[PDB]
Structure 1
Amino acid sequence: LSVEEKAQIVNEYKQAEGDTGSPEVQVALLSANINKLQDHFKANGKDHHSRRGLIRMVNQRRKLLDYLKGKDVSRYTALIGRLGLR
């Protein structure tokens, strides 16, 4: 993922902060990066050592959602529907 494509996302899903630590910043950065790789793995089929890196990012994303659900519900469904998951 590029540098300005990171800066496009942090500007968008900022929690009126200027700050990159909140889960709505972190979940957004991972989800844009999984969608980019899906055509790398339709050309490269036998790329197994890079398949291993993608499953790290998927499992990291389901851990931050349950932390988000384990605190609030209003912040949760305002983020699930804004990305279209589950």
Structure 2
Amino acid sequence: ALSVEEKAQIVNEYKQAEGDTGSPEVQVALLSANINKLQDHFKANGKDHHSRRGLIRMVNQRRKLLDYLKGKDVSRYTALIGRLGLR
């Protein structure tokens, strides 16, 4: 998984009436942080496709959570596409 220090760290800018861990600030961008740091083990273990099928499972679900923000909230979408180093 992610680091025990980190998975409780990254929520500190996702707060937005802080008790939310459910809006797509969290399941995009905890999950975007899952994308950006678990690249490491692939370089050593390139013969195990079980771990990047989870990557494509949630980067679609991130894009699915981008897809609902296409219509529900375009303005807070700019906080996602403008930030995080996307695209």
Give the alignment's TM-score, normalised by structure 1: 0.87
Higher RCO structure (Cα 8 Å, ≥6 apart): 2
Question: Equivalents in 1 of 2:80, 2:12: separation in Å?
Answer: 15
Q: List per-residue Cα deviations over 1:3-45 (Å, max 9, x = no partner).
A: 3311111122111332201111111110001111212111111
Change (3 A) 1:26 1:51: closer
Matches within 5 A, 1:1-86: 1-86=2-87
Change (3 A) 1:16 1:38: same
Residue-pair matches, total: 86
Runs of 4+, deviation exceeding 6 Å: none
Q: Provide the secondary structure at the position in 1 that maps to 2:76.
A: helix
Question: Equivalents in 2 of 1:20, 1:81: separation in Å?
Answer: 21
Give the alignment's TM-score, normalised by structure 2: 0.86
Structure 1: runs of 5 or more not aligned:
none
43-52 vs 22-31, greater mean Cα deviation: 43-52
Q: List per-residue Cα deviations over 1:50-71 (Å, max 9, x = no partner).
A: 2322211211110001111211
CA-atom RMSD, angstroms?
Answer: 1.4
